[PDB]
Design a protein around this ligand. Sequence first.
Ligand code: HMX
Length: 246
Amino acid sequence: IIGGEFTTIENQPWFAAIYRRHRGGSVTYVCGGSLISPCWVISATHCFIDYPKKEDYIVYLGRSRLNSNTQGEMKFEVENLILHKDYSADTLAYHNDIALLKIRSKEGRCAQPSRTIQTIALPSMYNDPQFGTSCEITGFGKEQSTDYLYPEQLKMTVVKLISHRECQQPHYYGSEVTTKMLCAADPQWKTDSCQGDSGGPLVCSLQGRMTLTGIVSWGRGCALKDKPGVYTRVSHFLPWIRSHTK
Ligand SMILES: NC(N)=NC(=O)c1nc(Cl)c(N2CCCCCC2)nc1N
């Protein structure tokens, strides 16, 4: 997250931190995710497209910090890693950038809701908020496009949904953004998602509900003028999601 503020998991209790354990026994952070039901975390396919063995992944819930344990966090194995069959990557964009991780504790359980863990609601299909709506993003991604390291403390910020019309202009992303995507940015370009935030939630109040409206997918650079963040548009994917979750 570029700009924005530090926060704790209690302010975004659906956020899931996904890591990969290495043969060296080293474990490195991969991407964010969102708990949409007790046994399911939703994230972005591009995060795991290169290494698809479920075995080498670990999901934490209730976690406020990148490389130290947060009191009340839970650790999970990945029982099923479901990557979208129609995923592809273009020059900038990713398509169908959506994945499901069915989580199981080594003791066989799914998530137990707490002060630090809650599911987030999905939207009704094709139901999104209007352009100009303020939504929240959260992650452990870079604080500067140019950083080597990720921050140790969880961050979040606020961005406004952009119109597709606005996003499809040539100076923005032109032809590479599609209707299966959503664009969100700061009006002044101050704050944004970045590398390491992928898979993480874009949350909006829809109806009277905090709803998961997007998944962090891509952008050029981070916090660049006329280069907004692009997110998987969740409302388009209810059939896919329900297929696996039933
Ligand atoms: N929102 C804005 N402006 N950018 C981003 O969200 C964003 N930016 C980058 Cl650099 C990024 N990378 C870099 C390699 C390509 C994709 C995976 C990791 N992923 C993102 N999701």
